[PDB]
Amino acid sequence: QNWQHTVGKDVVAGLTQREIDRQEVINELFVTEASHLRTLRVLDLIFYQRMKKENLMPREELARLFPNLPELIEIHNSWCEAMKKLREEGPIIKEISDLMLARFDGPAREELQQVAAQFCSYQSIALELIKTKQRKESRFQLFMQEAESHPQCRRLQLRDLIISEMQRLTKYPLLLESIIKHTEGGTSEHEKLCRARDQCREILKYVNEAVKQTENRHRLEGYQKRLDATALERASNPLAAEFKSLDLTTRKMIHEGPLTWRISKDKTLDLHVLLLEDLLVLLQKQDEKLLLKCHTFSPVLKLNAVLIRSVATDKRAFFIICTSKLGPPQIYELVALTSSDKNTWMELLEEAVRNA
Amino acid sequence: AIRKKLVIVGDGACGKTCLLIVFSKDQFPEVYVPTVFENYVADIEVDGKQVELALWDTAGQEDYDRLRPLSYPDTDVILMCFSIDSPDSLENIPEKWTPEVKHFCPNVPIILVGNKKDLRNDEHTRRELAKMKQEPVKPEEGRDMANRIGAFGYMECSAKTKDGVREVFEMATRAALQ
Numbered sequence: 001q002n003w004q005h006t007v008g009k010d011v012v013a014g015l016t017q018r019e020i021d022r023q024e025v026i027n028e029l030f031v032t033e034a035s036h037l038r039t040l041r042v043l044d045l046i047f048y049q050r051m052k053k054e055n056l057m058p059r060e061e062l063a064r065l066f067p068n069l070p071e072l073i074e075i076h077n078s079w080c081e082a083m084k085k086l087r088e089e090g091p092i093i094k095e096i097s098d099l100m101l102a103r104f105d106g107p108a109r110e111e112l113q114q115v116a117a118q119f120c121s122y123q124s125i126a127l128e129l130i131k132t133k134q135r136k137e138s139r140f141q142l143f144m145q146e147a148e149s150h151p152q153c154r155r156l157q158l159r160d161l162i163i164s165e166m167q168r169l170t171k172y173p174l175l176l177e178s179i180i181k182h183t184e185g186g187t188s189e190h191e192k193l194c195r196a197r198d199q200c201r202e203i204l205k206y207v208n209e210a211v212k213q214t215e216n217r218h219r220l221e222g223y224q225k226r227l228d229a230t231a232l233e234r235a236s237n238p239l240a241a242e243f244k245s246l247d248l249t250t251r252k253m254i255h256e257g258p259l260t261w262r263i264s265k266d267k268t269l270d271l272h273v274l275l276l277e278d279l280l281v282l283l284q285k286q287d288e289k290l291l292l293k294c295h296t297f298s299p300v301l302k303l304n305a306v307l308i309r310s311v312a313t314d315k316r317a318f319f320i321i322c323t324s325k326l327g328p329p330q331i332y333e334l335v336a337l338t339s340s341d342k343n344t345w346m347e348l349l350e351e352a353v354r355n356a
Numbered sequence: 357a358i359r360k361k362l363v364i365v366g367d368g369a370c371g372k373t374c375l376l377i378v379f380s381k382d383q384f385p386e387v388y389v390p391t392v393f394e395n396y397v398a399d400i401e402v403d404g405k406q407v408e409l410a411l412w413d414t415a416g417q418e419d420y421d422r423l424r425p426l427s428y429p430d431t432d433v434i435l436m437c438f439s440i441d442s443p444d445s446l447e448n449i450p451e452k453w454t455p456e457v458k459h460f461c462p463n464v465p466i467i468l469v470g471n472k473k474d475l476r477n478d479e480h481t482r483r484e485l486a487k488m489k490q491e492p493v494k495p496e497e498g499r500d501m502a503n504r505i506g507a508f509g510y511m512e513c514s515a516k517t518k519d520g521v522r523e524v525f526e527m528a529t530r531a532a533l534q
């Protein structure tokens with residue numbers, strides 16, 4: 001388990017430390033690719049195919065948990081087989097950039113990010129479902145224990161193995177940076193490796209974004225059900241009534257979080273707040289319901305009609321100042337959990353305002 | 357079997373992966389330091405008790421704010437790392453990692469770890485940090501951050517020497533059992 005030992009034992013002396021190190025990293029890449037493929041085939045054989053064959057769950061559920069596994073496996077197997085081909089021409093691997101570009105650039109990039117994103121985007125939700133299922137269904141809990149007892153699982157659970165694809169993608173840039181580091185500069189090789197490294201980052205950003213939007217969408221549907229915008233079915237101040245039929249489902253979420261509202265000088269209101277693309281929405285938790293409600297102060301703010309200001313004496317607090325001539329003469333004074341949180345909330349608030 | 361899940365978090369420069377490797381192998385790797393540490397179960401005994409400690413690396417996830425949370429569920433103990441040769445990594449403890457970990461792992465114990473302690477007194481290091489006008493982190497600063505963030509404990513180690521490594525994990529495991 002290590003290139004200088006193993007292969008390249010009589011062939012080591014010939015080489016520089018840099019070229020030894022280059023070989024090691026390339027070897028790690030190859031060996032951990034095959035290893036990753038192994039893990040996917042464990043998912044296939046121990047879990048997916050058995051769940052399917054023995055009807056452990058409705059096919060509609062199973063497809064959400066394992067959307068495109070055979071495709072995922074072939075993405076990696078094909079690449080793996082090209083690695084084998086290249087190792088065939090001797091244990092000292094020469095140029096590698098084209099093999100990297102064949103997985104991470106152009107069409108091959110589009111394919112990998114689509115397939116990886118479809119496999120991962122919904123995964124946190126499917127796993128929560130599986131967890132529920134295990135609690136509630138004895139046949140299912142039993143099957144999961146039996147499957148996880150298989151030695152191929154290496155004592156891990158399904159939730160610990162199914163995340164391997166996301167984790168594998170995060171390693172490629174790091175493995176490329178280290179190869180690049182041990183590659184002679186001024187080379188086309190070197191340039192093309194940098195290109196591959198950069199495209200891997202872009203692939204991670206794409207999968208990051210898919211998970212974000214898929215989870216956010218599911219989260220906002222759940223919130224919508226629990227939304228009660230009833231006290232705005234009437235109105236007090238004019239500027240609240242237009243959000244009586246506020247539908248969270250039709251907007252994008254940027255951020256969310258608890259904030260304390262300093263409404264007067266010795267009154268506070270504990271809020272949960274959504275930062276959407278166009279609106280900041282202030283909600284009160286009330287059992288399991290999310291109350292959209294005045295105080296008067298409006299509970300919805302339009303980001304195109306506000307300014308954001310720090311508070312010099314309170315590193316956890318920030319102001320929102322409504323700029324409509326119909327606005328309140330009062331500022332919304334909001335308090336975050338920490339100074340860090342307040343930095344985050346402000347950075348994102350200012351950005352969203354610039355784009356509103 | 358008592359099964360616990362440990363997740364290691366901190367800045368990308370701070371030696372997360374390598375720390376997991378020496379704990380798991382009881383050996384600093386001589387000729388080559390791997391970039392990849394796969395999810396893996398380690399056996400460890402602490403206080404009489406046998407424990408299976410599922411080890412999760414997060415290296416490479418530091419720029420991807422919606423990939424990271426995927427490792428968090430069912431975590432039993434968090435190892436939060438900075439590196440003693442990087443006070444920048446230390447300042448991200450309260451600035452980045454602590455709020456994230458408290459949000460996604462409420463009530464999960466945290467152990468703060470200062471890696472690379474062998475460098476507190478390496479001169480190449482002292483001088484480099486001279487330039488940006490800094491110096492190696494000191495145990496008192498480490499320790500104060502630990503109380504600041506509500507950590508269950510503070511620990512320093514050096515992966516290169518293996519010094520304090522076992523002790524890091526033993527502490528993390530005790531925290532998982534409480």
Ligand SMILES: CCN(c1cccc(CCC(=O)O)c1)c1ccc2ccccc2n1
Nearest residue numbers: 368369370371372373374389415472515516
């Ligand atoms: C490349 C070897 N290395 C290291 C450095 C930065 C990051 C990493 C692991 C990457 C990560 O997991 O964030 C390992 C270490 C790891 C531990 C060290 C302890 C003392 C002195 C130097 C050390 N170097």
